[PDB]
Design a protein around this ligand. Structure first.
Ligand SMILES: O=C(O)c1c[nH]c(=O)[nH]c1=O
Length: 228
């Protein structure tokens, strides 16, 4: 797959072009992971899900949501940031809190499940700064080569002749703020929704309505945030 096949196959045609400057660095990340299995350590999510955020069209992205790194618990990380498979409960405490802020912000009721597939299908890019994690070790793949990719991805978005709003959750996500120096690309910066940091100003941050206020301001269409 990842070290084996070129971007033209792994991601959507628009992303494959945007991420051309890190084609090798993606190849390299393929190698790093094979070495992790060889050494007898695992990673999350499954090889086929690592790049999933980029299987939705690059040209369609209106909003960017950026976490730190994938759910450390087996059966959680699906390769879209904060999403879980529809049949997963309890929701990770991180998602539960994203949903409290979601009901508070937008008025809407609690989603049925934790599948955020719909946000992705509507122009929300669900990214982590880092695309893999060793199971049960938050931040274990920090500075292993993923940063250059998620930075390239963000630069390519901001370069687009397109409106962009960026929601950056936590310090690792905020390090992408400089590449969003572009004036056709505004940024919402709040603490991470994880319990450790949520009380620190995630709660009441109102990112969803504010994102939509900013999109309307750039003559772009709001995101339909509404989840089944
Ligand atoms: O930034 C984060 O904490 C997360 C980002 N993406 C996920 O899939 N899970 C998380 O917990």
């Amino acid at each position: 797959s990842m070290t084996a096949r070129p971007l033209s196959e792994l991601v959507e045609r628009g992303w494959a072009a945007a991420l051309e400057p890190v084609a090798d660095q993606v190849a390299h990340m393929g190698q790093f992971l094979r070495a992790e299995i060889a050494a007898g350590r695992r990673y999350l999510p499954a090889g086929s899900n690592v790049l999933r955020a980029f299987t939705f069209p690059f040209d369609n992205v209106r909003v960017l949501i950026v976490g730190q790194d994938p759910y450390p618990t087996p059966g959680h990380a699906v390769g879209l940031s904060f999403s879980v498979a529809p049949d997963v409960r309890p929701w990770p405490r991180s998602l539960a809190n994203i949903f409290d802020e979601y009901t508070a912000d937008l008025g809407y009721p609690l989603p049925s499940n934790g599948d955020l597939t719909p946000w992705a299908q509507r122009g929300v890019l669900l990214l982590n700064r880092v695309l893999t994690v060793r199971p049960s070790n938050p931040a274990s793949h920090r500075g292993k080569g993923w940063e250059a990719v998620t930075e390239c991805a963000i630069r390519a978005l901001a370069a687009r002749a397109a409106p962009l709003v960026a929601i950056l959750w936590g310090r690792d996500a905020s390090t992408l703020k400089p590449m969003l120096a572009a004036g056709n690309c505004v940024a919402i910066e709040s603490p991470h929704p994880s319990p450790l940091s949520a009380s620190r100003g995630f709660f009441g941050s109102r990112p969803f309505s504010r994102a939509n206020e900013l999109l309307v301001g750039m003559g772009a269409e709001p995101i339909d945030w509404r989840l089944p």
